[PDB]
Each structure stands twice: as structure tokens, then as C-alpha cells.
Amino acid sequence: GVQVSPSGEKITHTGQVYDEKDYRRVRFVDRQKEVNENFAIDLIAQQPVNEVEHRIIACDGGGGALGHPKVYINLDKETKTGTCGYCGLQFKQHH
């Protein structure tokens, strides 16, 4: 989530933060640095892994035509989850 650098400036979800000696920090004086606080990397990691009965699962992201292009995920490797390349949801084969 949002952390602060030693200069006190918030660090973004892209890792951006001005140096302490960066003059461009002047632009936030008496104003503010806009930083979205809901990091997608943290929220997607909070989702539980989906357990399925097959070795191929299809993900369209939910909502049918409101999600993402339907893709098929291979679940043969038992040492890791199959992750959807669009929406980041994880799936695992039951056995």
C-alpha cells in the first residue's frame, strides 16, 4: 500500500517518488501529490484461489461480455497456480 519516503512524500503504486534534492517537489508546496490508495497488486493478492475439477479452466473475468476476452488456463503443474493473464485470478486443480 501507500508508504512514505524519507522526505515524507507518498510513494505511488508504480514506485514513483521524487528525490529529496529534486526541485520538482516544489509543485506540491501548498498543494498535494495525488496518489490512489487502493493498490491493485495488494487487492488481487487478497483473493482466494479457485479450486476446479478439470485441468483446463476458462476465465472471462466475470460478467460475461463485461469482463475480458475468454481465455483457457492450464492447471497441470501442481507446484503453482494458473493465473489469468487478464484479471489476475488464480485457479488450482483439486487433485
Partner 1 sequence: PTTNPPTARKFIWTNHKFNVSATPEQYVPYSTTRKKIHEWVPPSTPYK
Partner 2 sequence: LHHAVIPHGKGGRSSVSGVVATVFGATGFLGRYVVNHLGRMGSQVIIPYRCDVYDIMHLRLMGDLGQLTFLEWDARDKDSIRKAVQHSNVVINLIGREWETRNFDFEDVFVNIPRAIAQASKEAGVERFIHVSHLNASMKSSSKSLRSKAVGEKEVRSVFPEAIIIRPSDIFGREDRFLNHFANYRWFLAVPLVSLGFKTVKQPVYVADVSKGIVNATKDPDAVGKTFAFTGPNRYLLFHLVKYIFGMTHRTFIPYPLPLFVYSWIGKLFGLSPFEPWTTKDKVERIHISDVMPTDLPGLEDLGVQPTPLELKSIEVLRRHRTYRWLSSEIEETKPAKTVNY
Residues near partner 1 (CB under 8 A) are 12, 14-16, 24, 27-28, 30-34, 38, 43
What is d(CA 21, CA 3) in angstroms, rounded to the nearest whole number? 19
How many angstroms separate the Cα of 27 from the Cα of each of 22, 30, 35? 11, 8, 15
Instruction: State CA 92 to chain mean position distance.
Output: 19
Cβ 11 to partner 2 shortest distance, Å: 18
**Least distance in Å: CB of 29 to partner 1?**
10
- Tell me: does residue 19 bind partner 2 (CB under 8 A): yes
Quick check: 30 binds partner 2 (CB under 8 A)? yes
